[PDB]
Amino acid sequence: MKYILVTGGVISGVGKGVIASSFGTLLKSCGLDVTSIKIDPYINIDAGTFSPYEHGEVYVLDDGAEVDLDLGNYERFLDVTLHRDNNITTGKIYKLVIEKERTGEYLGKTVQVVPHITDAIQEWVERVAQTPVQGSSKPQVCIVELGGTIGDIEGMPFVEAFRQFQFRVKRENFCLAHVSLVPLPKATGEPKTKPTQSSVRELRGCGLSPDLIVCRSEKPIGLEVKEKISNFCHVGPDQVICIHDLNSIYHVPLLMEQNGVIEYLNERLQLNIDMSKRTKCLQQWRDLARRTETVRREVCIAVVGKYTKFTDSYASVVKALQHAALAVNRKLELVFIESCLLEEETLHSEPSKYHKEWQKLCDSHGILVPGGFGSRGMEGKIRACQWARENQKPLLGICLGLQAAVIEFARNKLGLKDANTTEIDPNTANALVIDMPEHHTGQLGGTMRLGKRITVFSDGPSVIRQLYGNPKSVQERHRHRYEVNPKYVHLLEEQGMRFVGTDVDKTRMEIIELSGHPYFVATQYHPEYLSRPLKPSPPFLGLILASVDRLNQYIQ
């Protein structure tokens, strides 16, 4: 095949993920079949035990492998369905090699980093880059992205493995893009090139040589600094790209394409791309990038979550709201509301912030309760569900709203003050939601119902069912272990609550939909993982429509 390593420069967070996804969505428009790999140099088998604050919004694949977030970036930009093995980590490699050694497949030899770990890495990359990722099309380009910055101790095995790969795989079949940062200190007033120079030198001291250099700055740098980069890093002034901070990332593919990163790649990897045909293929992205600027309607949605401090803990939620808002042709305006600044405990401590957050929640066309883990801020979600239930305000719950809304409904419509979750209060006599960990080896429901499953709609007219297109079953991605208690089912059904969607066994209620309320859907799965820029998700679409009050008109 043909590989494109995308290493990283001064810092982590410069834009490797967006640059890699842009390479992917260019080579995909030009006709090729692209796959991707993300290499995390951390010693973790998978992100299934990470916190959102670490790197943000643990993803979920179809087979059930909690992975990084760039694994979702790739899917949203390429419309592919990656697998568990598209995420290499130091832990995976070392565990594989250790198991092989113990079982004796390295029979009588000193297993050392070079060459055994790097041969494991190369065989992993070569075996994964050929797994059919979009049906039955054998891939043709593989965008490997190396996490972290060049120079770390954790990423020495990978830089060495690729230093050998670039010769093992016939260098005409291997590019390398080095994304770097060009700071512009406000005190001085001129962009500085020493960081990129030092990073390029450190990358050369490891053998590799940058075939491209993407200079990521805040404002467009002039031509003086491009000449300085080209000279002091020894690359042609046409293979140094400048990508400043654009408005939306749907502009990065186009900004690179107008800098000839299709011409350069087709010359450097010999891809045989027909330019006389590639013109009218990157059109949906121009359309999207223009709709990103030509919307003035200001629909404001409330996100009442726990981790609302770093704006990457909800990357999937935010990028699934933006897709729907762009599809309806309204302009999104997100407000982030903590769920702990909604209980009386801060009313006694900080009434100022209490009232400020409650006001923000009040003047907002819609409410969204994300998922999460733990007991902190769980009662604030109950408060928000109660408010949106008694104020006729649209609301959507994803895998934890379906819990924090049944809890409310029960407590404040049937009086069971004892209602709670088996996690929150294990000694409750009213367990409205109980776990179902009967696995013992994973064949029953049991452990976290990870991956994609089957959800069939029960009978009856339902707004969310109409939204999906009235099919019989849809497959979404669950990351839950609990469930609604099957003895409060009728107790909550002889009230304003419904139960439309569930599985084949019919003992896992997963789509609740209040009656009389304009929009009070809440689902047990994660509908945000299946959203794509040209194919938004039906629950978020319904939330936005019912929020700007166009839902019935859209239905008709």
Ligand X SMILES: O=c1ccn([C@@H]2O[C@H](COP(=O)(O)OP(=O)(O)OP(=O)(O)O)[C@@H](O)[C@H]2O)c(=O)[nH]1
Ligand Y SMILES: Nc1nc2c(ncn2[C@@H]2O[C@H](COP(=O)(O)OP(=O)(O)OP(=O)(O)O)[C@@H](O)[C@H]2O)c(=O)[nH]1
Ligand Z SMILES: N[C@@H](CCC(=O)O)C(=O)O
Ligand U SMILES: Nc1ncnc2c1ncn2[C@@H]1O[C@H](COP(=O)(O)OP(=O)(O)OP(=O)(O)O)[C@@H](O)[C@H]1O
Residue closer to ligand Y (CB basis): 353 or 376: 376
Q: Is 389 helix (H, G, I), strand (E, B) or coil?
A: helix
Distance CA 379, CA 53 (A): 21
Q: What are the φ and ψ backbone dihedral angles of 237, each rounded to 5 degrees?
A: -65, 5
- Name which of residues 276 to 295 contact a copy of itself (CB under 8 A): none
Contact track, ligand Y, 334-373, x by CB under 6 A: ---------------------------------------x
Asked if residue 384 binds ligand Z (CB under 6 A), the reply is: no
Q: Does 481 bind ligand Z (CB under 6 A)?
A: yes
If DSSP codes are grouped into helix, strand and coil, which group holds residue 510? strand
**422 near a copy of itself, judged by CB under 8 A:** no
The reply on whether position 42 binds ligand Y by CB under 6 A is: no
Contact status: 178 vs ligand U (CB under 6 A): no
Q: How far apart are CA 51 and CA 91, in angstroms?
A: 18
Q: What does the alpha-carbon distance between residue 269 and residue 166 come to, in Å, rounded to a whole number?
A: 13
- In 10 A of CB 44, how many CB atoms? 15
- Nearest CA among 555, 548, 546, 543 for reference residue 397: 543
- How big is the chain by its Cα radius of gyration, in Å? 25
235 lies in the binding site for ligand U (CB under 6 A): no
Task: Supply the angle between the helices 194-204 and 223-233 in degrees, to the nearest 10.
Answer: 20
Among 31, 84, 94, 439, binds a copy of itself (CB under 8 A): 94
3-state secondary structure of 409: helix
For 355, the token pair is 């009232």
What 8-state DSSP symbol labels residue 116? I
Residue 70 binds to Mg ion (criterion: CB under 5 A): yes
Instruction: For residue 52, give Cα distances in angstroms to 2, 48, 371, 415, 492.
Output: 34, 11, 11, 35, 33
DSSP helix/strand/coil, 119: helix
**Closer to a copy of itself at the Cβ: 110 or 352?**
110
411: DSSP letter: H
Find the residue with minimal CB distance to ligand X: 193
Site string for ligand Y, 119-158 (x = CB under 6 A): ----------------------------------------
In the complex, the smallest distance separating the C-beta of residue 549 from ligand Y, rounded to whole angstroms, is 35
Cβ neighbours of residue 457 closer than 8 Å, sequence gap 6 or more: 465, 471, 472, 473, 500, 501, 511
Q: Is 246 exposed, middle or buried (0-12, 13-18, 19+ CB in 10 A)?
A: middle
The contact pattern for a copy of itself, residues 299-318, with x = CB under 8 A and - = no contact, is: -----------xx-------
Buried (b) or exposed (e) across 492-526, using 16+ Cβ within 10 A? beeeebbbbbbbeeeebbbbbbbeebebbbbbbbb
- Residue 484 tokens read as 């609604």
Residue 325 Cβ, how far from ligand U at the closest point, in Å? 16
- Binds Mg ion (CB under 5 A): choice among 9, 15, 17, 155: 17
Q: Evaluate whether 286 touches 254 at the Cβ level (below 8 Å).
A: yes
Which listed range, 178-186, 271-279, 383-391, 478-486, lies at the site for ligand Z (CB under 6 A)?
478-486
Q: Which of 4, 7, 10, 17 binds ligand U (CB under 6 A)?
A: 17
Residue type at position 59: Y
- 18 near ligand U (CB under 6 A): yes
Whether 526 is catalytic: yes
- Report the nearest approach of ligand Z to the CB of residue 485 (Å): 13
Q: Which residues inside 21-40 make contact with ligand U, applying CB under 6 A? A: none
Give the shortest CB-400-to-ligand Z separation in angstroms.
Answer: 3
| Binding footprint of Mg ion, residue count (CB under 5 A) | 3
Residues 293-332 binding ligand Y (CB under 6 A) are 306
3 state DSSP class of 67: coil
CB of 48 to ligand Y, least distance (A): 7
Query: Interface with ligand Y includes 49 (CB under 6 A)?
Result: yes
Q: Compute the least distance from the CB of residue 232 to a copy of itself, in Å.
A: 8
Binding track, positions 183-222, relative to ligand Y; x by CB under 6 A: ----------------------------------------
**Contact positions toward ligand U, by CB under 6 A?**
8, 12-18, 55, 70, 147, 187-188, 243, 245-246, 249, 252
Catalytically annotated residues: 399, 526, 528
**Contact positions toward ligand Y, by CB under 6 A?**
49-53, 108, 306, 373-374, 376
**Contact positions toward ligand X, by CB under 6 A?**
11-12, 40-42, 110, 112, 147-149, 152, 154-155, 192-194, 228
